[PDB]
């Protein structure tokens with residue numbers, strides 16, 4: 001089964017999915033390897049080939065540091081790369097339904113990982129279920145992360161910043177030029193991504209260069225206005241320079257700094273990325289998107305505020321316990337191996353961990369807003385507050401503010417509150433509905449009866465998969481057949497959102513409303 005693309009032929013493979021067949025093209029190159037003199041530059045266009053490119057296994061993941069905090073723990077290692085790290089990593093994957101479709105809606109996945117980590121080839125990013133069940137084509141790509149993907153000397157094309165975002169953009173282009181040969185409709189392309197992937201999606205809504213490359217957008221636990229999502233030009237240069245010094249590449253001619261940083265090995269650059277910041281947090285994005293003047297022409301919050309984005313529908317949502325995942329990466333008193341009952345003193349020390357460069361009065365004002373308990377004798381109060389602090393501040397409140405702001409310019413938006421905890425979730429129970437653990441439901445892993453999921457979970461996945469597919473195809477995330485709860489548009493007055501769970505799907509109004517006035521109004525002033 002061979003498909004002719006604009007650059008040459010590619011041979012895929014057949015997969016047996018639910019007594020059916022998906023055709024998989026795994027590891028198709030979509031740019032010149034950003035190697036040698038090409039490191040830190042925008043992706044260069046790919047030179048044609050004449051052979052049959054054998055896109056029959058996932059390609060290299062991009063160079064990155066690996067989570068080594070829990071060796072042998074599936075809860076952390078399910079996210080570590082599962083192919084060789086290599087600078088040669090600009091590849092994508094395509095899952096098409098068999099029999100080859102005529103004009104199928106295309107779903108493009110963008111992974112997260114704090115812009116430092118991630119790869120398309122992970123078990124929970126497998127698009128064969130969606131292809132099999134919903135007759136959509138699924139595409140995913142590897143893009144450069146960390147400094148190799150986001151080092152920034154503004155202006156200077158030898159390190160302009162946002163390389164990783166231009167990698168994604170190049171893959172969106174590849175879909176535009178080639179997906180029709182796979183049976184896909186380039187006029188019906190939904191981007192979707194989680195975490196930093198979701199912030200990437202929202203940044204494609206603002207990038208003029210991407211406005212013609214997709215139709216609709218889905219943002220899972222992420223948006224560009226989250227406090228980790230955009231590196232300032234000050235930080236970007238202090239961090240570029242502190243990488244120079246850390247590698248002995250401190251020079252004056254800022255181009256020779258890059259030429260020097262180019263003869264370093266990826267490892268030399270990888271192991272110094274951690275220390276370019278004086279104080280980090282589990283949520284540190286040392287090298288991320290910047291206002292480069294190319295992909296991003298102004299501070300994105302201004303573009304958002306003043307309506308400078310692609311006018312289309314969005315699906316946005318967040319999980320019930322976004323914060324907890326990061327508490328076990330540094331917060332005192334927290335462990336995945338006990339119930340992490342922390343004290344007032346421990347909660348205070350945890351704030352110093354997550355808000356290190358914040359005034360005493362600023363930390364005092366977080367504590368104040370989060371320690372007015374109904375019952376002051378509940379030992380988990382401080383444990384849950386700190387998770388909620390990280391979750392509200394880093395994910396939930398910015399997603400809500402993005403959705404209010406975006407819908408004020410007239411487009412349909414739909415907001416969800418995923419609040420089911422997987423029966424297979426390998427982290428402990430006090431960590432709740434964790435950051436990242438709707439993804440497997442989105443991709444339909446519970447649709448495999450063999451995969452050790454409950455029947456209730458198969459039904460929730462099936463409803464989510466249909467809602468996502470219906471949003472992609474028709475911009476309306478309804479499940480119209482099984483008397484499902486209808487999903488109302490998020491208007492900026494009523495702010496209705498849909499809860500996703502295995503029990504009762506419900507329509508609620510104005511999520512974390514008291515909490516988000518704090519983060520969105522008061523706290524930016526400190």
Ligand SMILES: *[C@@H]1O[C@H](CO[C@@H]2O[C@@H](C)[C@@H](O)[C@@H](O)[C@@H]2O)[C@@H](O[C@@H]2O[C@H](CO)[C@@H](O)[C@H](O)[C@H]2NC(C)=O)[C@H](O)[C@H]1NC(C)=O
Nearest residue numbers: 234235238239241242243244245246274275276277278279
């Ligand atoms: C801008 O960078 C300087 C230099 O960073 C230091 O050197 C790097 C290569 C790396 O090793 C970093 O961890 C170092 O901090 C920062 O200045 C340092 O700030 C810390 C605390 O803020 C202080 O204890 C050090 O003595 C400082 N070192 C020097 C040489 O000034 C500086 O804070 C950065 N500016 C920011 C973050 O606004």
Ligand SMILES: *[C@@H]1O[C@H](CO[C@@H]2O[C@@H](C)[C@@H](O)[C@@H](O)[C@@H]2O)[C@@H](O[C@@H]2O[C@H](CO)[C@@H](O)[C@H](O)[C@H]2NC(C)=O)[C@H](O)[C@H]1NC(C)=O
Nearest residue numbers: 330331332333334335336337338339340341342343346379
């Ligand atoms: C929960 O565990 C934390 C983490 O401690 C580590 O992990 C445990 C599973 C166990 O193997 C411990 O021996 C490990 O140290 C505990 O935090 C420690 O608490 C003590 C005093 O309470 C303090 O001196 C240590 O510095 C802490 N260590 C760390 C790494 O934070 C915590 O006490 C445990 N809490 C409960 C309620 O069970």
Ligand SMILES: *[C@@H]1O[C@H](CO)[C@@H](O[C@@H]2O[C@H](CO)[C@@H](O)[C@H](O)[C@H]2NC(C)=O)[C@H](O)[C@H]1NC(C)=O
Nearest residue numbers: 458459460461462463464466467479480481482
């Ligand atoms: C809605 O419920 C119906 C059953 O009442 C589901 O339709 C079945 O779907 C499964 C696989 O998804 C097939 O094995 C069956 O043959 C289908 N038909 C029947 C008559 O059972 C449908 O999947 C549900 N849709 C949702 C939850 O979106």
Ligand SMILES: O=C(Nc1ccccc1)O[C@@H]1C2CCN(CC2)[C@H]1Cc1cccnc1
Nearest residue numbers: 079112113114195228282283284285325436
């Ligand atoms: O969101 C981030 N990183 C992150 C880092 C800095 C700032 C913002 C975001 O985490 C990832 C992500 C994708 C894979 N899975 C699921 C969601 C997580 C694995 C993990 C979780 C906590 C700490 N480190 C790694």
Ligand SMILES: *[C@@H]1O[C@H](CO[C@@H]2O[C@@H](C)[C@@H](O)[C@@H](O)[C@@H]2O)[C@@H](O)[C@H](O)[C@H]1NC(C)=O
Nearest residue numbers: 102103105185187188189215472473474475
């Ligand atoms: C494929 O369909 C094209 C029109 O696409 C339509 O509009 C977009 C926005 C999507 O929402 C999608 O569902 C619609 O079908 C036609 O112009 C094109 O000629 C068709 N090509 C085929 C059938 O080969």
Ligand SMILES: *[C@@H]1O[C@H](CO)[C@@H](O)[C@H](O)[C@H]1NC(C)=O
Nearest residue numbers: 011012051052053054055056
């Ligand atoms: C591509 O796959 C075919 C089919 O198995 C094989 O014969 C051919 O040698 C492959 N090409 C390579 C490995 O370059």
Ligand SMILES: *[C@@H]1O[C@H](CO)[C@@H](O)[C@H](O)[C@H]1NC(C)=O
Nearest residue numbers: 158252253254255256257259
């Ligand atoms: C910096 O070095 C580059 C590389 O040779 C050169 O092209 C550029 O003009 C230099 N700029 C200066 C010296 O300001």
Ligand SMILES: [Cl-]
Nearest residue numbers: 493495510513
């Ligand atoms: Cl209100």
Ligand code: NA
Nearest residue numbers: 042043044157
């Ligand atoms: Na260019």
